[PDB]
Amino acid sequence: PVDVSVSIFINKIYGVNTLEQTYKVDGYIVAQWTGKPRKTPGDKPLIVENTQIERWINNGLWVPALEFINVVGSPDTGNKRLMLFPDGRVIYNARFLGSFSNDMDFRLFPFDRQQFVLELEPFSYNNQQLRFSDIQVYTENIDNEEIDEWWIRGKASTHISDIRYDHLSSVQPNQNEFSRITVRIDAVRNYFSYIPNIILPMLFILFISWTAFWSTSYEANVTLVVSTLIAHIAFNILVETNLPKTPYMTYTGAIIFMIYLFYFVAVIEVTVQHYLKVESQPARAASITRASRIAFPVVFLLANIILAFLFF
């Protein structure tokens, strides 16, 4: 079992896709493994570059196949460098930029909780142990909390585990166990701009519909409730890109669907106020309007607390 020291540097974690549950990660990968003693020109260790790296393997130099398990497509390896030491050890430094998949829960978008995971397992070698994992997410979080989309919390989670496989070759009494690095950086999305850009204006439009709970004129009432619903849909179109859309139900989506009913229900109230006045019963219509004038804001507050009580 060849011991490999893996040190991964983290520079950027950008472009979090709300559909494919993908995110682009940039940095550097360092693999210091003890090889076999070789002769370098003099005492100083040899420095080999990307083009000449393949030339060394042809001559009889070992290079282990360390592949990312959760990588979506082939990641972009910039410049790769092999540092052959006269003593024996070899240091492999390579810049990488690729897409990584991890199960994401967007259920509670306004106060999002997400984990960015990176996994590495040698593609061809099982009885070749991975010594120690090191995550250097030295890109300062408290430096620009407003500028950074995600508030980096904790200097990642180091985890080294032996992944057991089932479907393999004929000889597996102790070949099914592959060493695997499990890097997991945590982050919390900043609500800072999501309230005065999405939440707050989507609420005002809904309360503007509620101004028909004072107005007696049905012609003016229709214009309020119908047009605000147009404004709500229009504003939901503007937002949509910022909004995360997943196959499951969300707290934001639950509120968004709840708003659609509170328009439909208000339309009913306004129409009820009208038909009562038409059928010479305005005494009911008078109290019906006064009721919903206090009921609607209370009911929406109860239900928003109900949703929050279920999601949190």
- Subset of 211-270 contacting a copy of itself (CB under 8 A): 211, 214-220, 222-224, 226-231, 233-238, 240, 242, 245-249, 253-254, 256-257, 260-261, 263-264, 267-268
**Angle at CA of residue 295, ends 294 and 300, nearest 5°:** 115
Closer by beta carbon to a copy of itself, 87 or else 162: 87
Nearer to a copy of itself, 162 or 242 (CB): 242
Residue 256 C-beta: closest distance to a copy of itself, Å: 8
Q: Which residue has the tokens 């060849």?
A: 2
If the CB atoms of residues 39 and 167 are measured against a copy of itself, the closer one turns out to be 167
- State in angstroms the smallest separation of the CB of 302 from a copy of itself: 19
**Count of residues engaged in binding a copy of itself, rule: CB under 8 A:** 109
Region 280-299 residues binding a copy of itself, contact defined as CB under 8 A: none
**Smallest gap from residue 293 Cβ to a copy of itself (A):** 11
Tell me the pairing of strands 177-189 and 160-164.
Answer: antiparallel
Q: Which is nearer to a copy of itself, 83 or 160 (CB)?
A: 83
Give min distance, CB of 66 to a copy of itself, in A.
Answer: 9
CB of 72 to a copy of itself, least distance (A): 7
> How many residues are recorded in the chain?
312
- In the complex, what is the shortest distance from the CB of residue 248 to a copy of itself, in angstroms, rounded to a whole number? 4
Of residues 72, 160, 286, 303, which one binds a copy of itself by CB under 8 A?
72
Under the binding rule (CB under 8 A), the answer on residue 149 touching a copy of itself is yes
**Among positions 18, 129, 161, 190, the unique one binding a copy of itself when judged by CB under 8 A:** 190
Residues near 302 by beta carbon (within 8 Å), at least 6 away in sequence: none
Are 184 and 134 in contact by the 8 Å Cβ rule? The answer is: no
For residue 188, state whether it binds a copy of itself (rule: CB under 8 A). Answer: no
Q: Which stretch binds a copy of itself (CB under 8 A): 68-76, 111-119, 178-186, 301-309?
A: 68-76
67 binds a copy of itself (CB under 8 A): yes
Judged by CB under 8 A, the chain residues 30 through 59 that form the site for a copy of itself are 32, 45, 47, 49-52, 54-55, 57-58
161 vs 299: CA distance, rounded Å: 51
Q: Site residues for a copy of itself, window 116-145 (CB under 8 A)?
A: 123-125, 134, 136, 138, 144
Single residue of 39, 42, 142, 146 touching a copy of itself by CB under 8 A: 146
DSSP secondary structure letters along the chain: ---EEEEEEEEEEE---TTT-EEEEEEEEEEEEE------SSSSPEEEEHHHHHHHHHHT-----EEETTEEEEEEEEEEEEEE-SSSEEEEEEEEEEEEE-----TTGGG-EEEEEEEEEESS-SSS-EEEEEEE--S-SSSSTTTSSEEEESS----EEEEE-SS--S--SS-SEEEEEEEEEEEEE--TTHIIIIIHHHHHHHHHHGGGGT---HHHHHHHHHHHHHHHHHHHHHHTTTS---SS--HHHHHHHHHHHHHHHHHHHHHHHHHHHHTT-HHHHHHHHHHHHHHHHHHHHHHHHHHHHHH-
Q: Taking contact as CB under 8 A, which single stretch among the options 111-119, 198-206, 284-292, 304-312 is the one that binds a copy of itself?
A: 198-206
CB of 223 to a copy of itself, least distance (A): 5
